[PDB]
Structure formats: structure tokens, C-alpha cells
Amino acid sequence: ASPSINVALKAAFPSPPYLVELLETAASDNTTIYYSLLDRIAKGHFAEATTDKALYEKFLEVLRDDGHMDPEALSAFKLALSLRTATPRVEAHYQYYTATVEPSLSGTQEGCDQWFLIDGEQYCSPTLDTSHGKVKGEDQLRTLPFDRKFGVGSRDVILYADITSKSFAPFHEVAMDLAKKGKASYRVRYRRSPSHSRESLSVNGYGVELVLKRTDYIVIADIKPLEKSELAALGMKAASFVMQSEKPFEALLKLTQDFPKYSNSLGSQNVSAEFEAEHRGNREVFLPEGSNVLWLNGLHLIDRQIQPFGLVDLLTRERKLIKSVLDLGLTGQQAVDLLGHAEVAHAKSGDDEPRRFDWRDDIEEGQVIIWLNNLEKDKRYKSFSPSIWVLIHHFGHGLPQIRRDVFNLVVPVDLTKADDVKIVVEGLLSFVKRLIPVRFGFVPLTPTGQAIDQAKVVYYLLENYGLAAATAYLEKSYEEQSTGQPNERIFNEVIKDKSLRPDGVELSFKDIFISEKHEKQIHLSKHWVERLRAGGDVPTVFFDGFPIPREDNWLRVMNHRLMQDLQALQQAGYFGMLNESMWLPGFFLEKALSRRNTLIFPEDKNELTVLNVNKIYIENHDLMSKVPVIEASKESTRDDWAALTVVADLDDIEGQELVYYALRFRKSNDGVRLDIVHNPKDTSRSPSVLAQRLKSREDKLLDFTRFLDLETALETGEFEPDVAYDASLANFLASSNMKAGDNFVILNGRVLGPITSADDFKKEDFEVFLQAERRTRILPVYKALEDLGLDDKVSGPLSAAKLTSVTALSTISDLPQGIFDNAPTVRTTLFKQWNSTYTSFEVGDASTATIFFVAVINPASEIGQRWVAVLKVLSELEGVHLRVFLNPTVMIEELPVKRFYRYVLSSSPSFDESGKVKALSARFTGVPRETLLVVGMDVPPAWLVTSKVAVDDLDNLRIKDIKAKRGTEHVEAIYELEHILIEGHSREIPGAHAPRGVQLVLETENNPHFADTIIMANLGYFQFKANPGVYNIRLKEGRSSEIFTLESVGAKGWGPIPGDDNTEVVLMDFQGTTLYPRLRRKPGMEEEDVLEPSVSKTEHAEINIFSVASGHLYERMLNIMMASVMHHTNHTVKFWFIEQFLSPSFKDFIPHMAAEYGFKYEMVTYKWPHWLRQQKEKQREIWGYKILFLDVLFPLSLDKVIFVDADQIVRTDMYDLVEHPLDGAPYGFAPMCDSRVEMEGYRFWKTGYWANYLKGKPYHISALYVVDLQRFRELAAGDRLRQQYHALSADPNSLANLDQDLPNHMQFTIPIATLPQEWLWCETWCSDETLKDARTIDLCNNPMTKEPKLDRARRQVPEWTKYDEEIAELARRVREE
Ligand SMILES: *[C@@H]1O[C@H](CO)[C@@H](O[C@@H]2O[C@H](CO)[C@@H](O[C@@H]3O[C@H](CO)[C@@H](O)[C@H](O[C@H]4O[C@H](CO[C@H]5O[C@H](CO[C@H]6O[C@H](CO)[C@@H](O)[C@H](O)[C@@H]6O)[C@@H](O)[C@H](O[C@H]6O[C@H](CO)[C@@H](O)[C@H](O)[C@@H]6O)[C@@H]5O)[C@@H](O)[C@H](O)[C@@H]4O)[C@@H]3O)[C@H](O)[C@H]2NC(C)=O)[C@H](O)[C@H]1NC(C)=O
Ligand SMILES: *[C@@H]1O[C@H](CO)[C@@H](O[C@@H]2O[C@H](CO)[C@@H](O[C@@H]3O[C@H](CO[C@H]4O[C@H](CO[C@H]5O[C@H](CO)[C@@H](O)[C@H](O)[C@@H]5O)[C@@H](O)[C@H](O)[C@@H]4O)[C@@H](O)[C@H](O[C@H]4O[C@H](CO)[C@@H](O)[C@H](O[C@H]5O[C@H](CO)[C@@H](O)[C@H](O)[C@@H]5O)[C@@H]4O)[C@@H]3O)[C@H](O)[C@H]2NC(C)=O)[C@H](O)[C@H]1NC(C)=O
Ligand SMILES: *[C@@H]1O[C@H](CO)[C@@H](O[C@@H]2O[C@H](CO)[C@@H](O[C@@H]3O[C@H](CO)[C@@H](O)[C@H](O[C@H]4O[C@H](CO[C@H]5O[C@H](CO)[C@@H](O)[C@H](O)[C@@H]5O)[C@@H](O)[C@H](O)[C@@H]4O)[C@@H]3O)[C@H](O)[C@H]2NC(C)=O)[C@H](O)[C@H]1NC(C)=O
Ligand SMILES: *[C@@H]1O[C@H](CO)[C@@H](O[C@@H]2O[C@H](CO)[C@@H](O[C@@H]3O[C@H](CO[C@H]4O[C@H](CO)[C@@H](O)[C@H](O)[C@@H]4O)[C@@H](O)[C@H](O[C@H]4O[C@H](CO)[C@@H](O)[C@H](O)[C@@H]4O)[C@@H]3O)[C@H](O)[C@H]2NC(C)=O)[C@H](O)[C@H]1NC(C)=O
Ligand SMILES: [Ca+2]
Ligand SMILES: [Pt+2]
Ligand SMILES: [Pt+2]
Ligand SMILES: [Pt+2]
Q1: Which residues have CB atoms below 5 A from the ion given as ligand 5?
Q2: Domain at 362-587, CATH class
Q3: Are 731 and 152 in contact (CB under 8 A)?
Q4: 702 carries a ligand binding annotation
Q5: Domain 986-1081, second-level architecture
Q6: Residue 34 labelled as part of a binding site
Q7: Pocket flag, ligand 2, residue 582 (CB < 6 Å)
Q8: How far is CA 921 from the centre of its chain?
Q9: Is 1350 helix (H, G, I), strand (E, B) or coil?
Q10: Distances (CA, A) of 1249 to 716, 1246, 1294
Q11: What are the residue ranges spanned by the domains of the chain?
Q12: CB of 66 shorter than 6 A to ligand 3
């Protein structure tokens, strides 16, 4: 009975058969569930269910009966099935099939509904006797994202099937059995089934908004009744209403959806209830008032992640993690509590800190470092104070002089190399002479004969008294040509000054063989260099235990840490942490490690891979119950416990050397539990044999002394290859990121590798690896775990590893830090402090729940409207707990909620009277008749949406008008999910920077030019508009491919994850595709694309004009604008439109305008980037579209474009604007009229701000402008517009009209070609005498009038009606056609 508004969304691809959709939804990523169900339907088991409901009903019984899903997983299945999450995954198959299979399968297909593909040969029969073809094109055997494999087999077999028919069942069984035997590996690909209809897909998981477009009025339903200054209490009174209500969750939803309507209805019946002002004790401690914050098991979620799809993927990932933990008898509550524990988060913060290594001589008994200083005893520094306050009282960029030991620098030098020697002589000594407060040491490098000798020479001379003498040899040797070999001619003169007085020393060129000098000194030195990996092609310098490689201005690097260390000391001093009797260098050495490994301590701190240990022993039980295992000792302590697994190629010296070290390390550490996985490069000989050789010798392996005993044990014994072991072996490596013949080391789930050389990982390297790993991951788990009293659950080394490994996985970055939010992956428990009695309500059983949600919603917020709606539906799921906190603000200067909101989502599928799946829609009932409303779509980030069906003006909705024009109080509108985004964040390799101005091309096997875009400066951002299918990204041929080669598109993650050296993208989800591509510069390039070392016309048109209209009137005016151009030019014109702001009525009309006026048209759009600052106000969005995305909105093939406003009319042949010289400027604009005499008052660009800023430059008009696009992109103007906009936009009152104001603010930075004013006329600011020579007319809003735009047009232009009549009769001609 009530006046209603209904909005629905449909996808750009037809609905896949329900059967296949349930198969896919059901088996998310578990293959066993997939083929176990594929058997069931090939029985013909699912043939007897006639309707979708019955079919759905059948799946529930099956899954429950076969043990596939438990209540928790079943509930999750229903929600994912409502969401229709599997539909794009199925469409990926079809698009792949349509575009790569059919054109590479030459011949005549009839009866070949299904067909296996074997060795590039097609077989239409199960009996496999005859083969139709040699399939053309690239290999289809490439394993791609949507593939499934069943079994391991030398041969690879693919079946392209239409499951729907019964013709499928025998083909399946042929290859299912063939795989069950082990002849070949089986996989299913889909074929679009013609039994099913080509009806489009009805989607859900989006939001609809009805925005009040008139907010200006402030002091069943007709119009909202407003309110005076009492705004301040809205949030507060709104929060109370709910608390009081009795069924609070429902209230919030009912209140929050129709909130603008209930504003005046608040403040009634002794409303405030001031008990809830008690809990600002909880605002005093943690979050600011009116802020929306969501947590999922401690994880703080960003707004983008708060949609149904984003949330389904998070549960899926989270449950996998927790379930792993709760097989050790922990409740979901206990598991989460452990993950977010204080001791755990402390460790992440702990090793976010920079790493230092112990540079001391202590281990090598003080005989390796030859210091050029001592600050406590050098009689250079005698003058200086040895006081702590000297440090603390130092400001500036310098360094305080002090007689104390505080800063140290040890530099390893090769005495053969001139450049290396030069460092000590010039570099190091100057610093000494200069009285720098840094102690300087150096240790010689011994990698060649001559080097060994020269270390001996210098070292020995020093050891047993010589100082200045050794220095002297070095200096003389360096200056005296270039000595990279000992020179006696030079050496002998140095000795001539007989300063060798302090206690007897040997003399001559006998390069000493003294067991003390040659052996101890040189071997001790080598032990220091090896220990800290301080040698090689690139040696390593240690400043305060901080490794700085000896490359390009390392002293610049040193100075940076020198200042950073000094500031670190000062802070401790002002807090009185420091005292006078202290060794200051040991403030840094507190956490320093004795040994240094680049694998354990990579310089890229993020580089970390951890595997779920429970998973490893669950998936590969067949493998891991038959690997040689050294159990960790019976009588060792929990603190000692650790689990180690070594993966190695025992058919290589490095592979077996690595294992010998691991075995050696095990003898020493009784607590470790060792596993050996033999991973061979060549699988001609079964891997099971060598594993079987060792497990027999398992008792006897740890009981030995020599390497050959291990070598010999590998050779001896006769064994039967367990091919079942071999299968689980190759599955393990595939699941883990591991190649064949590659060496890896796994301690408590953490993987290091591949190990290229076994000298990289020695016995001493395992010891530090355990020491470091122990610290971070094991000790924080142990403490935290014990604090909760769950320390009964640890029963051994393998038992422990399950927990430590899981908690390490919980804190993994992906989504990468610095992209969506800078904040680290730390699970807070910080809201547990909050009192809950009067602001919170919970839904779900906390005792059973695996998912714990903590929502902090401000009822007065518009963001809250969506949050409540989504959370209600996720709250309905079994095994989920939710707790809500309401936190309003007292700061309400403007109206809080200015829209109505509906979320299209269900927790389980709904069925028809005919049993078909119910489509979902947003229905607003009892809409006020007199309020002007705007329809908006609040769609997931990867989606691009436009109106398809609507007869109404969605930008100007009023029920009274529709009733008085259409006769109906009921409105229906249908949208189309036209595109889904492929978006990514680029980087250059190895010196990672965003490659800006790089051009990209998206392609498919059908067409090599799907789309094109250019790389942005901000996060190396780029995007493509696409739908489900298999694509490829090639750098655009030209300057881009000249400078770069892209190794990869980051489809696996930030990585590099091995196996991702690919350029293939596929989208099979409603979340699109997120990519992290990598591009490495070609041989010796410091080049830039942006600077140099009839095409567009042919492709498009002579003239390219683009525009936007946001209403039926403005669209009607746009029709006139296009016509005026056409009458005024006999040239070829192409029109470009901003697709999403236009009505379907307009959209359905243009082909008819194009036939009549003879122009070409193209619809364009771009999705507003996530990083780029949003516009809550639609009019402002539109303005942003005209200026911010000029370089990326139009295809690269377009040389230039012209913007003409909708209300405009043109009397000129528009080419002239193209031919207009821009004198090296990217875009051209027309200025504001000065000609009108008496208008001055309203000319605001002659005021202080605009006249001070625009020193001499004009105040330009955004109604008309030219963009020399080739130059625009070449100058990279867009990036500058975007970052200045983002920076300026922080202030809300910054840009009144951004479109005009941005080019004006940027005309100093970016040239603006100024146009002849013959190019623009407006009555408001130009005289009537001016219009004779006027080229085009804008209808600028007169502010001294209220005469409407329709009136100005008829009065101002007499030919306006002539244009309108033409359109009017044509519209009727079409309607009567
Ligand atoms: C776009 O599309 C079309 C086709 O491609 C075309 O559009 C033209 O636009 C004009 C308006 O700009 C149309 O109107 C005519 O404009 C002229 C003014 O130039 C008017 O005089 C004319 O009225 C009468 O005369 C027409 C023909 O007379 C003209 O002839 C001379 C032009 O040169 C050609 O002459 C003949 C063809 O006639 C040919 O053999 C030659 O090789 C030349 O190519 C010119 O010297 C004339 O001027 C004298 O005479 C007039 C009186 O006629 C007098 O007033 C003058 O003082 C002078 O002594 C004269 O212009 C005739 O066709 C009309 O029917 C009418 O009787 C129109 O109002 C025009 O119809 C139209 N077509 C052409 C081909 O011109 C353009 O090619 C395209 N335009 C753009 C912008 O892209
Ligand atoms: C000035 O600068 C100094 C130097 O930088 C700073 O001094 C102290 O720095 C410590 C941090 O490194 C803080 O810890 C305190 O230590 C003292 C003494 O150290 C004890 O432990 C040592 C550890 O031994 C191991 O390691 C060394 C190598 O590092 C190795 O050689 C050993 O073999 C061994 O493996 C011992 O070497 C040392 O002999 C001594 O035992 C300690 O007294 C502090 O303890 C306080 O708190 C505990 C409870 O946490 C309490 O039990 C203590 O009671 C004492 O008194 C009763 C009754 O007489 C007696 O029964 C006990 O046996 C205790 O002796 C005591 O109240 C603490 O652990 C320390 O904070 C820090 N400063 C102070 C003031 O303590 C510091 O900046 C300044 N200190 C001074 C005094 O100048
Ligand atoms: C992909 O999907 C498949 C199928 O949906 C999943 O595979 C399932 O995994 C189950 C894992 O537990 C497995 O259960 C096994 O059942 C046998 C027979 O009872 C047990 O011998 C196995 O050993 C494990 O558990 C026992 C003790 O548990 C049993 O007894 C208690 C009562 O005392 C019962 O509560 C319990 O349910 C078990 O019956 C231990 O002693 C062993 O040491 C060992 O840990 C397994 O429990 C299923 O057979 C298997 N298939 C099906 C149809 O459910 C697969 O997990 C999934 N993968 C992913 C990634 O989720
Ligand atoms: C969540 O909800 C709880 C509900 O209990 C709030 O707790 C209140 O906390 C305040 C501040 O601590 C309490 O007020 C004070 O209590 C003192 C007694 O407790 C102290 O001593 C015990 C040991 O005996 C300690 O364990 C404890 O930590 C306290 O230190 C009184 O001595 C205080 O009196 C002082 O102030 C008054 C008023 O100015 C003077 O007249 C006195 O002479 C004296 O100087 C004081 O009363 C309060 O009792 C607690 N309860 C309530 C209902 O408020 C949490 O604050 C709240 N947290 C959040 C984040 O919202
Ligand atoms: Ca205008
Ligand atoms: Pt400095
Ligand atoms: Pt401090
Ligand atoms: Pt991003």
C-alpha cells in the first residue's frame, strides 16, 4: 500500500547452472570434497532433484552425511551460496574455453560435447581409440588458478565437460579410475552448457543509498521534520533508545536504516538516561567519540574489508588457522586469547627493531682487530671530558667530543687492492687526526696469497710493538705506485727507523710461520670474517654492530646511524637510565648475536615464510610417518624443545653436506627433534629408496663421527620403491613453495632457503637460527601460553611447534603494510579494558564461537548504517560471536545522517514458489512523498556499476511528481555490474620505486588489445575494467618495452613467491584481482619515458569531445550541445561520455542520435582509487572526474580531447580548437569575462586570496578546455593534479569548485595555455555587444537572479528551440518506430 522504491543489481554475465555452482561453493579449495561430490553426481544421484531448492536441500544432507562439513562450515556454506561467490569462478572457465580452446581446436565438432585432451590430441570418446586433432597455439597444460588436480601421474589429462547432461558420467569414470591407478593426473575444465538459459545473474552483497539532496533546511511521512541547535544530543539520545529498547540489535538496524526520518522522533519520553555517560570512562581510556572501529580476533579491519565478500574470505582464512590450534584441545576463546597476548605482540615490536652483531675480539682472544684509536687513553683526546653529560648536552648534526668509549667502527680491508688500502690511509687516518669521537678499527681480508702474506707483514709488525711503523708501510706502499704485493724496497726503508725496542722481535722477509703469528693470527682473523660474513665481492663494515656493506658512500650510511645512535643515548640519559660507571658500547650489544647469517637475518625484514606445522603432518601423514626421524631426548625440558626439518637433495654434495651439519647440531642439542626429507632434482630413480635406506639406519645414524659413514649408508641396502610415499612427497613440495633439487631448512615452521651452497648453513648457523627463532617465536609463545595456563597442552617438540608455528602465521602482513593502511599487523586486546554493562550487547555463544567480532559503532554515522546491516547477517552465522559498543559524538555542527540505507544480503539462500533461487533487492517502503532523493550504490571496491533499467530520474526522485506523471507511487530501477577490477601496485627492481608514465596493455588470446592504462606515481597504481576470464599484461610496445622488461605480475602476493615469474592474470572472484608487478630496467638504463631520446583521427575521429550530465534536464541540454557542434562542422566528430552519471533513457537513445547526426560515441569511466581522497558530495565527484583522471580515462591511441559542458551551445566549427597552438602546454582554458560593466561586485577572483595567489595569471573557466593528451601524459600532469588535490583536500573548505580551482592553483607548476575569449560567452559576465564574435555560450548561474536554465536558453539563444524540436520529433519517431 505504501509508496515504495526497489533497486536490484544484475551481473554482465549469464547465470551458471545451479548444480555446478553448488559443487564449487561446497568445495572451496579442498579438492577431496570436489571429486567426492563429482562421484555423487556421476552416479546420477543428483538427477532426481527437479528444483534448485530440492537440489540445495540434497547438498546439505550429503555434506553432513559424508562428514564434509560440520555445523560451523555448513552455516558458512549457506552464506557463501547466497552471495553466489562461485559464479565468477565458473565464468572464468567459460571465457577461457570461448577465447583460447575453440580457436585452437581446428576441425568440425559434432558429438564432441565432452573431450579429453592428451599430448595435444583430442579424444571425443572414453574408449580413446581415435584422435581428432593436433591442437594449435600455446600449451593448455599450464596449471592455472581455477584448476583442480586429482592424483599424481606422469601423463597429464584434461576433460572439458558439460556436467549438466548424463553424457558426462562415463567419461569421468574412465579418468577417475585411470588417476586412482596412477597412470596420469586428472583435472576438470568447464564448457558452457546450452541446456541452461542465457538469463543474466542477479547479485547481492551491495548497499543502496537514498541521499537527501537538499540539506539546507535547519532552524505516514510527508517530509522530514528538522530541529534547531539540539543536534549535539542525537548520537547520545540515539544510543540510549537502543539500549532501552529490549531487542537492541533490531532497533539499531530499524533506526539506522531510516535514521533521517527519526531525527525529530528522538529526544522523547525522558530520553537521555544518563547512566550511559558513565562509560566515557571507557572513552577516557581508548577511542575518540563517534569513531567506527571493527576487530576480528584482534585484527583491526579497514573499511574496504567490510563488505560481505571481504568478510567471508577473512573467516575462511581465520578458521583454518584456529582449527589447526584447536586440535590440541584449546577453545576458540583460549586460541584467540593466545594470539593477541601481550608477550606475543611485544616480540613482533622487538624484532621490528634493527639488528646488531657483536663485533668484538673476545671470541678470537683480542688478536684480530687492529685499532687506530683508543679514546680513553690516546693523549689527543686528553683535552676532552670523559663525561656522560657531554653526550646528553649535544644538539645539531655533529658529534660531541668525549674521552669515552661509545662509538666503534670496524672496517674489513683487502691489502692487495689499492682502493681498499686507500680507505685506511686517507679515509681512516684523517678521521683519527680530526679528533672524531669514533674509535676506528680494521681487519684485513685474506682471500689470496699476497693478501695472506701482507696481513702477516702488517699484523706481526703491529702485534709485538709497531704502530706508526705499520701505518708507515701502508702509506708508503700506497703512494709508491700501487703495491698489491709486499715490497721490500719499500718495507726495508720503513724498518730502517729501529723503533722495535719494546721486547725482542724477529726481522726479515721470512713471512713468518710461527704457530702463534701465522696460525693463530691469520686463522683467528679468518674466523672473525667468516663469523660475521664480512667478506666477498662486497665486504661488510660494522658500525656499533650494525652491518653496512662497503659500497657507494657507506660513511653517509654510517653518519645516519651515528646520529640515530647518539639520539638513542640522549633519551636514556634524560630519563636517567644511564650512569657514570658503564660501558656505553654495550647498550647496543645487549641484544647482539655472535653469528651473522643473511638467510636468518635478511636485510628485507619482511622476507619471511612460515608453514603451518599441523598442516604439514596432516596433509602428508603418508610421507612424514616414513621419513628418518631423530626424536628429541626423553629427558629434556619444555624450554629446550624445538622441531627441525631438513629438505635436501641427497644426490648432491651440498644436499648431503647440509644434512651432516644438521646431524652434528642434533648431537649437541638434546632438545631438538630432527626430520630428513630427501628432495632430489632427478626423479628418474624413486625418492622412496634413499629415504628407506636411512630409516633402517635411523638408530645408527646419530651414533657416528665421520661424513663417509652417511655417504656409505646412502649406497647400501636393497629397497622396494613405495610409490605411495613418492606421491605424498611431490604433493608436500607443491603445497609448500618448493622446487625439486632445492635445499631448505625448517625450524618450528619457519623456512629458510633455497640453500645454493651448504657453506652458507653450517652447524654454527643452526645454533644461531635456533637461538634467534627461540627468542622471538618460541619464548613469547611459551610465556603467553603459561600465563593463560594452557601449558599442559604442550606434550613434545612436535606438539609445541604446532602452537608456535600458528601464532607466527597470525601476525603475517599480507595485505602489505604501506598500501591500504600504514598500521602493522598487531592483534589488539586493548578494548578488553572497557566496561561493557551499559553500552554493549552480545550476540552468539562465546563458549562455542571461533569468530569474535568487536564492533564500535557510532549510531549518528552514515558508515554505521552499512556496518550494522552487514554485521547482522554475519551474526546469524553459527560459531560467530559479536559484541557491539555504541560511541556517539557531542560534536555535531551539521546534520549527522543525510540518507536512507538498505543492504542487499541474506545469511542463507531463499527459494521461489516454483523453487528457483530468489533474487535479492533493496526495497524502501513508506518513502516520504515530498523529499527530493538521489539513488546511490554502495558497492564492493572491485565493482563498477551503472544504471540499466529506470524510467525515473535517479538523481532527482520525488514521489509526488512520479505519481502526477506516471500514475504510480512505486519505483523500480535495475543496475548492471558491468565490470570487475584488475588492480595492482608496481615496483622497479632492484631499487624499488614506482615506475610512473609506464604504459600497459591488457590482452586475451582472442584480442591482443582488451584495454590499456598508464602507471601512476602513487603506489605504482594501475587498473583495468574486466569480467571473469584469463588475461595477460604486456608492456605497451614503444618506450616502455625499450626501457623495461616485466619479470612478473604479482598474482601470488607482494613476494616474490617462487612460481610467480608470470605475466598472466585471471579473475575468478567478486574481489577482483590484486597484483604486485615487478619491472627490472634493461641494460644500463637511467632513462625516463616522459622525456624523448592522423593515428587518433583514423581510429576515432577528427574531433574528440567529452562531457558529463547529472539529470534529465542536463541530459536534454547535452543532446542540444552535440547537435549544435554537428550543424556547425562538416568534419568527423567522436563523443566521449562519463558512463556512470548518465540515465538509461539517455543511454538507450544515443545510437539513434548517432545515426541522425553522423558521429561516433564511446562510453568511458575509471574507478576512483582507494588511496585517492573520496568525495561524499556527488556534484564534487563529477568535477573530480573531469580533471583528476584525464591521462587514464581515455585510451592511449587518443592524441587529444576537448571538454564541453552540458549546458553549452557551440556556433563554431570545433576543429579550430584542435589547431589552436598550445605552445608546449598540456591543456588550454578560456578566462573569465571582464566586459560586463556593472557586474564587478560578484567577481570574487579580484579579491585578496585569488588576486594574491594569481599574481598576474587569469582566473579560468572549466566549462570548456583542450587537453593535448600525448603531452599531458608526457608531462605526467595527472600525478601532480592528483597529489595536490589529495594534499589540498585535507581542509574541507579548500576547493569551492575543484574543476576550476585545481588548474588555476597548478598554473605556476603546470602551464595553462590561455584561450581567446572569442571562445566563451556568458550573459552574467560578458556584454551583449560581445556575443556577435562569440564562439560558444555557457549558461553560467546568475547570482543576481533565480531565472532557471530552461528560461536562459530560450531567451539567450533563439536557435535553442530549433535544436530541441529536432530531438523532440526524433524521440517520438523512435517511440512510434
Ligand atoms: C559543409 O557542407 C556543405 C557541403 O560540403 C558546404 O556548406 C556551404 O555553406 C554555405 C554557408 O557558409 C551555404 O550557403 C551559401 O553561402 C553562400 C555564401 O558563400 C551564399 O551566396 C549562398 O546563396 C546562394 O548562392 C549559392 C552559390 O553561390 C555562391 O557561389 C560562389 C562560391 O564558389 C563556388 O561557386 C560555384 C558554385 O556555385 C562553383 O562553380 C565554384 O567553383 C565555387 O566552388 C560565390 O562566388 C558566390 O558569391 C557571389 O554571389 C552571391 C549570390 O549568389 C553574392 O551575394 C556575392 O556577393 C557574390 O557576388 C556565392 O557565395 C547557391 O548554392 C545557393 O543555393 C544560393 O542561391 C548560400 O547561402 C552553402 O549552401 C553550402 N554549400 C557550398 C558548397 O558552399 C561547405 O562545403 C561545408 N562547410 C563547412 C564549414 O564545412
Ligand atoms: C649503574 O650502572 C650499572 C651497570 O650498567 C647498572 O647496574 C645494574 O644493571 C642490571 C642490568 O644488567 C640490573 O640488574 C640488577 O643486577 C644487580 C646485580 O647483578 C646480579 O646479577 C648478575 C647476573 O649474573 C649473571 O651474568 C653475569 C654477566 O652479566 C655473569 O658474570 C654471572 O656469572 C651470571 O651468569 C650477577 O653477576 C651479580 O653478581 C648479581 O647477582 C642485582 O643486585 C639487582 O637485583 C635487585 O633485584 C632483585 C629482584 O629482581 C633482588 O633479588 C636483588 O636483591 C639483592 O639483595 C639481596 C639482599 O642483600 C640479596 O640476597 C640478593 O642476592 C641480591 O643481591 C636486588 O634488589 C638487579 O638484578 C640493575 O637494575 C642495574 N642497577 C641496579 C641499581 O641494580 C645500573 O645502571 C647502575 N647500578 C649500580 C649499582 O651502579
Ligand atoms: C578435505 O576434506 C576431507 C573430507 O571432507 C577432510 O578429510 C577428513 O579428515 C578427518 C580428520 O580427522 C578424517 O578423520 C579420520 O577418521 C579416522 C577414523 O575415525 C581416524 O582414525 C583419523 O585419525 C585421527 O584421529 C584419531 C582420533 O579421532 C577419531 O576418534 C574420535 C573419538 O575418539 C572422533 O571424535 C574423531 O572424529 C575420529 O573419528 C587419532 O587417534 C589419530 O591420531 C588421528 O589424528 C581421523 O580422525 C576423515 O576420515 C577425513 N574424511 C572425511 C570424509 O571426513 C580433510 O580434512 C579436508 N581438508 C581440509 C584442508 O580441510
Ligand atoms: C570500570 O568500572 C569500574 C567499576 O568499579 C571503575 O572503577 C572505579 O575506579 C575508581 C578509581 O580507581 C574508584 O574510585 C576510587 O576508589 C578508591 C579505592 O580503591 C583503591 O584502593 C584499592 C585497594 O584498597 C585498589 O585496588 C584500587 O585500585 C584503588 O586504588 C578510593 O580510595 C578513591 O577515593 C579517593 O577519591 C575520593 C573522591 O575524589 C575521595 O573522597 C577519597 O578521599 C579518595 O581520595 C576512589 O573512590 C571507584 O570506586 C571504582 N568504581 C566505580 C563504580 O566507579 C573503573 O574506573 C572503570 N574503568 C573504565 C575504563 O571505565
Ligand atoms: Ca556550465
Ligand atoms: Pt651528522
Ligand atoms: Pt629509555
Ligand atoms: Pt592499493
Answers
A1: 1205, 1207, 1263, 1338
A2: alpha beta
A3: yes
A4: no
A5: Sandwich (2.60)
A6: no
A7: yes
A8: 32
A9: helix
A10: 91, 8, 12
A11: 232-340+827-892, 362-587, 613-805, 986-1081, 1095-1371
A12: yes
Distance CA 497, CA 515 (A): 28
How is the beta sheet containing 206-212 ordered, strand by strand? 899-904, 206-212, 933-938
Q: For residues 610 and 746, is the Cβ–Cβ distance under 8 A? A: no
Closest CA relative to residue 1089, chosen from 1196, 997, 1019: 997
Q: Domain 1095-1371 in CATH: superfamily?
A: Spore Coat Polysaccharide Biosynthesis Protein SpsA; Chain A (3.90.550.10)
Best residue for ligand 1 mutational test, from 1124, 1127, 1130, 1210 (most atoms within 8 Å of Cβ): 1130
Alpha carbon distance 93, 1068 (integer Å): 9
- Confirm or deny that 371 is annotated as ligand binding: no
| Ligand with minimal distance to 1132 CA | 1
Measure CA 324 to chain center: 26
| Residue 314, CA distances (Å) to 88, 292, 844, 946, 953 in order | 19, 19, 18, 28, 38
Burial of 471 (0-12, 13-18, 19+ CB in 10 A): buried
Q: 346 CA to middle of ligand 4, Å?
A: 29
Domains 362-587 and 613-805 are alike in CATH topology = yes
> How far is residue 163 from each of residues 59, 116, 171, 355, 1096, measured CA to CA in Å?
16, 14, 11, 57, 47
Nearest CA to ligand 3 atom 58: 30
Q: Smallest Cα–Cα separation from 644: which of 628, 656, 626, 662? A: 662
Helix, strand, coil proportions of the chain in percent (round to 5)? 40, 20, 45
Helix (H/G/I), strand (E/B), else coil: 460: helix
Spatial neighbors of 561 by CB under 8 A, at least 6 apart, are 543, 544, 546, 548
∠ CA 1032-1034-1039 to the nearest 5 degrees?
Answer: 170
Strand order in the sheet with 1029-1035: 1011-1014, 999-1003, 1029-1035, 1064-1067
How does DSSP assign 318-371, residue by residue? HHHHHHHHTTSS--HHHHHHHHT-HHHHHHHHHTTSPP-B---SGGGTT-S---
Complete edge-to-edge strand list for the sheet that includes strand 155-161: 121-123, 115-118, 155-161, 184-190
- Sheet-wide strand order for 546-549: 438-445, 407-414, 540-543, 546-549
Q: Parallel, antiparallel, or unpaired: how do β-strands 672-678 and 642-648 relate?
A: parallel
- The reply to whether ligand 2 has any atom less than 6 angstroms from the CB of 579 is yes
Residues with CB under 5 A from ligand 7 (ion): 572, 575, 577
Q: How far is the centre of ligand 7, averaged over its atoms, from the C-alpha of 571 (Å)?
A: 6
Contact 465, 502 (CB under 8 A): yes
Q: Ligand 2 centroid vs 586 CA: distance in angstroms?
A: 16
Burial 234-251 (b: 16+ CB within 10 A, else e): bbbbbbbbbbeeeebbeb
Asked whether residue 1113 is marked as a ligand-binding residue, the answer is no
Nearest to 877 by CA among 124, 168, 81, 23: 81
Please measure the distance between the N-terminal and C-terminal CA atoms of the chain and give it in whole angstroms: 36
How were these coordinates obtained?
Answer: X-ray
3 state SS of 1200: coil
* Cell (9 digits) for 415: 691489502
Nearest listed ligand to the Cα of residue 1264: 5
Domain 613-805, CATH among 3.40.630.30, 3.40.50.700, 3.40.30.10, 3.40.50.10490: 3.40.30.10
Residue among 28, 29, 30 to mutate when testing ligand 3 (max atoms within 8 A of CB): 30
| Beta carbon of 1102 within 6 Å of any ligand 1 atom | no
C-alpha–C-alpha distance, residues 466 and 1185, integer Å: 76
Neighbours of 571 (CB within 10 A): 11
